């Protein structure tokens, strides 16, 4: 039960809205990409521990 609701009225600020979306998205991407560094360092840890 969720569909985008027709806009009640023209957006007061078309920028502010898209800067917030880019910040949420950019921030999410940055957060996601640190986990790849964590997994890479964990893999190089487990290699020497297995050896």
């Amino acid at each position: 039960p969720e569909l985008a609701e027709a806009a009640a009225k023209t957006t007061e600020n078309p920028l502010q809205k898209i800067d917030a979306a880019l910040a949420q998205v950019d921030a999410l991407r940055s957060d996601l990409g640190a986990v790849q560094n964590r997994f890479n360092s964990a893999i190089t840890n487990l290699g020497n521990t297995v050896n």
Partner: protein, 50 residues
């Protein structure tokens, strides 16, 4: 210390070859595309700043 059921000399030497393979992979990756940062190349400063 002359064992053959597990050769402790060959395991480390291989790991070094794997590390060199990953370094070659990143260098080919950035040489073909033309760009240093893709995802995990730089986590926050590069991608967010970019």
């Amino acid at each position: 210390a002359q064992v053959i059921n597990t050769n402790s000399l060959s395991l480390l030497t291989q790991n070094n070859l794997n590390k060199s393979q990953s370094a070659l992979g990143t260098a080919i990756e950035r040489l073909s595309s033309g760009l240093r940062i893709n995802s995990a190349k730089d986590d926050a400063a590069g991608q967010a700043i970019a």
